[PDB]
Every structure is written in C-alpha cells, then in structure tokens.
C-alpha cells in the first residue's frame, strides 16, 4: 500500500520538477548574472545571494535524474545513492542558510539604514556564500555514521544507531533549521512590522521569502523531529509509525519542489529591483486640513489646520519629492502668514494653490511610496 503510493507519487512528481527547475533556475542564473553587471554595492550582493540559491537548487535539479534512475531499479548500484542523498542534503541546508542570510541582510538594511553602507558589499556576499558552501559540505561529510562496511542500502536512507541519537540529530537540526527558522522569523516579522509602520514590493518579497522557507523546510524538519521522537522514545503503535513514515517520505518527495518554489522569491526580488501608517496618515491629515480650511471662517481654525498640515508635511519629507515637499511647506508658510495677518480669504486662495501643488508634485509620492514601502 505505502510502497505502491510511494512509487506512483515519485514517478508522477519527479518528472515535472526536473524540467521546471532546469528551466526556471537556469533563467534566474542568467538573469542575475546579467544583473551583477550593474556593480552597485547594495544592488549586487542580493544578486550573489540569488545565484548562490540558484546553484544550491540546481544541485538538487541535477540530482533528480540520478535519484530517479537509481530508484526505478531494485538497488543495482548502492554507492551513488549516498551521493544522491548528500546532494539533496547540501541543497536543502545551503538553501536554508542562504535565504536566512538574505533575511538578515533585509532586516539590517531596514532597521539600521546606516550600517547597510558598510555591511552589504559584493565582497562580503561572495565571502559568506563561499563560507556557507564550505560549512554545509563539511557538515554533509559525516554521513557515514552507520557501520563502516556494507553502508546503507536504500535511497530513502533511514539509517540507524548514532544517526538518530542526540549526538547527531540535535547538532544538525538545531544548527540547520531551528536557529535559521527562528532568526528568520524574527527578522521577517520585524521587517514587516517596520514597513507597515512606514506605510508593498518589500513587504511582498519578505513575505515570499518567509513563505518559501516555511513551505520548503518546515515539513521535512518536522518529519525529522517527529521520527526522532517516535523511533527513539515512543512506542511503535504500528498505526502512528506507518503514518509518520508516510509523512516523512512524502516530505522527502515534496521538498524537492524547492527548486521551483524559489521562483516565488526570485520573481518578487526581480520586481523590486526593476522598480528601484505614518505616511498614509500624514497624507490623510494633509487632505483633511486642506478640506477643512475651505469650510472655515475664524482665522484661528485655519491657523490650526495649517499648523497640523505643516507638521504632517515635515514628517513626511523625511521618508524630486524633497523639492515638492519643500514648496508644499513653503506655500503652507505663506498661508500661515496670511492667516496671522488676519486675512482669511487670502488663506483660502493660498490653500487652493497648496492643493494644486499637492496634486502636481506630491501625488507622485504616496503612490510610488505605496509601491515599495
């Protein structure tokens, strides 16, 4: 039953993902390779992160044909199945740490606008991707934890003894999924909260990175931890063991869709790159006092409205747009001067001029602003 379903789902789902990866990941490789020509300090490191992710996923892409050919036969060649599993593991963990470092970079650029000048550098990016390659391959090196001879003889590679002991399961799982998952969650939540405080493309790309990370890594690592909790310190129960084996095998056959799921972060990063409540309520009060100036008779009322409008303009100026807000504050200043002089109708004329200045220079902001922030 479980074996028949295994064979059916494997033969059905490995066929498309190979072509999908070899097409879309290669397209991403080419696109970001052309994008690195721009050579800006902050506009390049992300492209090196993307090319690292694309290479890590292309590893799995090239592994898929080998895993298919070595599994469609009754284990004729047992040496290369270990290589296939090593490729899969290096792919997953390199992808995890690459996307997690991307989230670190985005969070440190958002929360600390000054440190990104000295942090985000193409040399730093090349160094960190090379470093993560080295450590991930070094941690994939000790996969020969079984008996020295014979070696494991199945491509789903359950393995035994010290593999599922705390000496191996924890130092791998905590340092490869749990810590990246936790720190990515913190970074992404803080980034989204800050961006929503400043309020779309950036929110979209952080959300896409977090969603891709969760969907592609949480199931397989949850299955790993569940097997550790079940086959070590929980009764077999037969039914639970069968269900958990089914779940972990499915996550094995569904985590290979990561090479395609990475397109959801690639596309949004590319859209953000092509394109390049605080602001919303600043615009709201600008319009509100602009409209209440018209229905006013006391000079004190128009003075108060102009004061609030000037405060809003000054606050929003810190988020072309520099000069537009400059002339907006200037016109608010003439309106305030006229109101202080005692004239009210002249304040209305100044407010009308302020309205046309806003419609001309300001409306481009709060429109592009609600497309990146």
């Amino acid at each position: 039953g479980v074996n028949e379903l295994m064979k059916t789902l494997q033969f059905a789902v490995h066929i498309p993902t190979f072509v999908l990866g070899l097409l879309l990941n290669l397209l991403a490789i080419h696109v970001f390779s052309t994008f690195l020509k721009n050579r800006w300090p902050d506009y390049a490191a992300t492209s090196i992160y993307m090319i690292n992710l694309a290479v890590f996923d292309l590893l799995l892409v090239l592994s898929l044909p080998f895993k298919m050919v070595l599994s469609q036969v009754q284990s004729p060649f047992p040496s290369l199945c270990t290589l296939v599993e090593c490729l899969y593991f290096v792919s997953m963990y390199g992808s995890v740490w690459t996307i997690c470092f991307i989230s670190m970079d985005r969070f440190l650029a958002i929360r600390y606008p000054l440190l990104v000048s000295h942090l985000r550098s193409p040399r730093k990016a090349f160094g960190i991707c090379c470093t993560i390659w080295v450590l991930v391959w070094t941690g994939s090196i000790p996969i020969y934890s079984f008996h020295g001879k014979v070696e494991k003889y199945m491509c789903f590679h359950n393995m035994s003894d010290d593999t599922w002991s705390a000496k191996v399961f924890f130092p791998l799982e905590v340092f490869g999924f749990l810590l990246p998952m936790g720190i990515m969650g913190f970074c992404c939540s803080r980034s989204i909260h800050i961006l929503l405080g400043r309020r779309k493309a950036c929110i979209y790309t952080i959300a896409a990175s977090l969603a891709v990370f969760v969907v592609s890594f949480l199931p397989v690592h949850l299955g790993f931890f569940l097997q550790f909790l079940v086959r070590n310190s929980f009764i077999v129960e037969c039914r639970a063991k069968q269900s958990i084996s089914f779940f972990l095998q499915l996550s094995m056959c569904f985590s290979n869709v990561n090479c395609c799921l990475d397109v959801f972060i690639y596309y949004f990063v590319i859209k953000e790159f092509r394109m390049n409540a605080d602001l919303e309520d600043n615009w709201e009060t600008l319009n509100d006092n602009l409209k209440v100036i018209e229905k006013a008779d006391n000079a004190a009322q128009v003075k108060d409205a102009l004061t609030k409008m000037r405060a809003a303009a000054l606050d929003a100026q810190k988020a072309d747009f520099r000069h537009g807000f400059d002339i907006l504050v200037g016109q608010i200043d003439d309106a305030l001067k006229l109101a202080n002089e005692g004239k009210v109708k002249e304040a209305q004329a100044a407010a009308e001029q302020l309205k046309t200045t806003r419609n001309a220079y300001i409306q481009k902001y709060l429109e592009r602003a609600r497309s990146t922030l």
């Epitope: 004061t307 609030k308 405060a311 809003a312 000054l314 504050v329 200037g330 200043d333 202080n340 002089e341």
Partner: antibody, heavy 124, light 109 residues
Amino acid sequence: EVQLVESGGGLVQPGGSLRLSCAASGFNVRSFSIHWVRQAPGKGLEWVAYISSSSGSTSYADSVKGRFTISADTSKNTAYLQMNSLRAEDTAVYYCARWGYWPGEPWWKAFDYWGQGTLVTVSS
Amino acid sequence: DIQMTQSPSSLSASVGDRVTITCRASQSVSSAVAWYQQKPGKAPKLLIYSASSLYSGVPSRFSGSRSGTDFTLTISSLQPEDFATYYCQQYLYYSLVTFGQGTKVEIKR
C-alpha cells in the same frame, strides 16, 4: 563669527516706552529671521515677537500682541522692539535670536546664535 | 498653543552618570525640537537642533531622540561643565515657537 548685541534696556516706569535694538554682525537681517525671547527673573524662556525683513512678516505672542511693535532696518542691520503700555509682568532679560529661512539646514537650526540679553526692569 | 512640557523640573546627578530629560508636545511636531543649555547669567546655546542632530561646537556627550511626540535628551557622560538649565523648544513655525519649563541639573551629594 556672527554676533548679536542688544542694547536699550533699563529703568522704565509702568506704562512707559522703550526700544531695544539688537544689532546683527556677521550676516544680514534680510537673510535670517530675528526673534525676541524674554526670560523673567528666575522663570523660563518666553517667545515675544518675530520679524522678517525679507517678507515683512511680523508676529507677536498672545500676551504681548497689540502693545509692542517689532521692526528691522536692513540698512543698519538692526532689529528694534518697541516697548509700549508696559506693566510689571514684562520685566525680564530680552534675547534677540536669529533663525534661518525655509528651506534647508538654516531653518532646522532653530536658534543657533543668540544675543547677550538686556535686563528690562519696570516698576513704579 | 503647542505646549511643550519636560518632566524633570530639577534633576540631580554626579559627575559621570547618564542624564535623561524627557519632553512632550501637545500636538505633533515632526522634528522641530531644539535643546538649549543656559548657564546662570548667560544666553542659551544650541545643543541638539532637530530631533537628534548634533550642533557643531558642543561635545558628543549630548544626544537626542524622538519617539513620536516624545523627545529626550541624553548627557550620558556628565562633566563639571554640564551643570546648567536645559530647555526644550518646539519650532514648527515662526509664530508658534514655545519653550519648556526647564530642567536644572545640579550636583548630587
């Protein structure tokens, strides 16, 4: 360097008149806004008036409006605040301060270069 | 009309502690806050123009920060020459400039 020297303050009977002339050296009164800030003895700082010779805009605080008239002659690069209808609550040390125009850094530096003060004392 | 109230009316500290003076505005002023230091019998001097910008000519011990409508001044490294009255000013517009009540920093003993 830029300096603001204020002179004129002294003994004035209640209801009298006095004219404090803060003189600007190092810049022009037409490129900066001159404000008057007064400090009652042992009390805090209170804004008095404001003059902008470039635009002719004059403003006064609520507790002073209608009595003192601020003026500035750009030929002499000096600003004059004219005491009128004085009362005992008006005795203080008067500070003439400069303030840049919009836009840019000069406006954001609110009162970078103050004066030296002139003790105006009023009582019968 | 834009009232500015600073909580510590008189704060006592020794030479070498962290001094925090907090200011609150009645209504929103974006960054139009300036901190002035007044030694007795002398004109005030600018310390922190804008919300956090540091004026050129005063030691880097003075720092400012903005939390919405709340403004704070930090003198984290005190010195025998930082004992004076510190004022909080809002300068949203020329005719609406208002000052705080002051904060006299004395010597703890």
